[PDB]
Design a protein around this ligand. Structure first.
Ligand SMILES: O=c1ccn([C@@H]2O[C@H](COP(=O)(O)O)[C@@H](O)[C@H]2O)c(=O)[nH]1
Ligand SMILES: [Mn+2]
Ligand SMILES: [Mn+2]
Length: 178
């Protein structure tokens, strides 16, 4: 799985993922499924932000904490949008809302609920993707056009298929906890 990650995700993604794990005292070489999940989520966040019109989205995920909150507090001051308790993943300038993105190895509905329970904030939009084509978003509002989403869903299927071809999928699939 370590070899799979370093081979299928670009170096910037892999570097951010390693940083996040070490910030929690975890070793990417040991908790390899977590390593793959973090890379995957980062990749989805970056694809999502490219999926709109130019400049539609601000990326919050992937930034160090100081810069992330700088962006968030700057957006809140400028738009008067409510300040979230937790860093979200993106801001949508067109819809004037933050977005929390989830990628789940389980089922989209359960993950969506966990995310909602956690945010509790009324304003932040939630969008969940799975590795088997399914998605779920707040009030069935999927934000991007279906072509953009299809490309995200297809990339995730492609990752699943790759892990499976290497016998990594069984372990990976069963590694997400409530
Ligand atoms: O404190 C944290 C926050 C997030 N994550 C992981 O980073 C990825 C993205 O988190 P989120 O933006 O969906 O909350 C997920 O795999 C999640 O479990 C952590 O390990 N620790
Ligand atoms: Mn995040
Ligand atoms: Mn997220």
């Amino acid at each position: 799985m370590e070899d799979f990650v370093r081979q299928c995700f670009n170096p910037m993604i892999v570097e951010l993922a390693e940083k996040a794990m070490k910030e929690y005292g975890e070793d990417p070489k040991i908790e390899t499924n977590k390593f793959a999940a973090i890379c995957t989520h980062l990749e989805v966040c970056f694809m999502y932000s490219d999926g709109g019109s130019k400049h539609r989205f601000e990326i919050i995920e992937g930034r160090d904490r100081i810069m992330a909150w700088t962006v968030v507090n700057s957006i809140c001051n400028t738009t008067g949008v409510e300040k979230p308790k937790f860093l979200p993943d993106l801001y949508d300038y067109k819809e004037n809302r933050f977005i929390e993105i989830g990628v789940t190895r389980r089922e989209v509905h359960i993950y969506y609920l966990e995310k909602a329970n956690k945010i509790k904030s009324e304003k932040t939009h939630i969008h969940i993707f799975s590795f088997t084509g399914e998605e779920m978003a707040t009030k069935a509002d999927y934000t991007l056009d279906e072509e953009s989403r299809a490309r995200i869903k297809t990339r995730l299927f492609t990752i699943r298929q790759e892990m499976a071809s290497r016998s990594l999928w069984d372990s990976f699939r069963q590694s997400e906890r409530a």
